[model samples]
Target: EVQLVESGGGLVQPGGSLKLSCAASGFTFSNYWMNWVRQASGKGLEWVGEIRSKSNNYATHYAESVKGRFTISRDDSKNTAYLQMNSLKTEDTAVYYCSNRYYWGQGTLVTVSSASTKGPSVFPLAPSSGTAALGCLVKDYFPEPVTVSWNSGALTSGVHTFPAVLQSSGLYSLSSVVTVPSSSLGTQTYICNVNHKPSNTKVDKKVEPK
Candidate 1:
């Protein structure tokens, strides 16, 4: 198993600078890529960027579309990578997550409710055709619960439909479901909204009913 040691905590003022580090142990740092993602209680995940130890720079996957104010760096000796975001605003408040290889860290929690407007929900939009499922996921230790809704706009209450099969290490995984009716086509949308402690984001995917 790979081990990632992330920065303990972060405190940054609005309009200031923000930086965090992720240190890897028990694994060959050069063999895997380091990625940074953002998450909130109800909001889904967002890909920030990534870096490879060998290159000492941002990975192509994240750098291609990324614009100003984001950077990724790596240090081989420490087996650690860093993600820095400049011009910090209330909008930047969210738990930052790092993954070395395919495994994720426990994740850091952040709340900027007092400083700025709560960011928009990130909804997943699915492709048209067959059924697609979407759901929120978090570290098993977190107290905030995830919410799911279908095209009918009704909440699936008390239903842990997205079964999180815990990995041996105790991480949780969850997914949502959407069944398309044959009579309708090209008008159905499946959405999952995460109402996190501080900020909320939505992930929505739309598929035509077949």
Candidate 2:
């Protein structure tokens, strides 16, 4: 029942800075691994970096694109994860997701523009290969870029993440699929969570034995 809630990050002019926060609860704050991810407008997702809660140490796998410009840190006492970025640009207007591998926050939208953004409509799609997997579709989102993840069951090795695609209306759509072994079928439930920023709305769909 672990939960992560992301906050902060509003409009910031170019060359300015912003800090985003992820408040964690329902589990040992110092016993699991937490990660930070970002998605720029009209682009695919980026793996920022991860924080080791057990040792309160930073992992060495930060994305090279954000190196020297972004910082990922944590506050054990506050049970929170933090991401800070400096020298922002218009392209930096995006949403950020904080994940512990299982649960994820709704996401915080940071913008460099003066326009508004819209949340997404999320739903479950039947597996493409009979009952071999589960799929989730997120569509009609504004300002582009969203974060998607799974929960309630362990995903198999065939997990697939599709890149965000532009829609005719100028919005975006994305989908994710995860293979579920036959052994776990009918014995497990899966949850698909989607996060849209600026609006910071969290939406989800559930798949269960049918």
User: Model 2: per-residue lDDT, tens digit, 1-210?
Assistant: 778999886766778898889999998887778888878656888888887755545563577777788888887789998888887778777788998777888887777754457678887776442337778888877665577778833554677879889788767789988887766666677788778764687877886545
lDDT agreement with native, every candidate = 0.57, 0.76
Give me the displacement of residue 165 in model 1, in angstroms.
27
- Per-residue lDDT for 24-139 in model 1, tens only? 88888876788988875568888888776565454535633333776877777888888777766666677888888578887765433223333233333343443343333333
lDDT of 1: 0.57
lDDT of 2 at 108: 76
lDDT of 1 at 205: 40
lDDT of residue 161 for candidate 2: 72
TM-score of 2: 0.53
By summed lDDT, the worst window of 10 consecutive residues in model 1 runs over 136-145
**Number of the top lDDT candidate:** 2
How good is model 1 by TM-score? 0.49
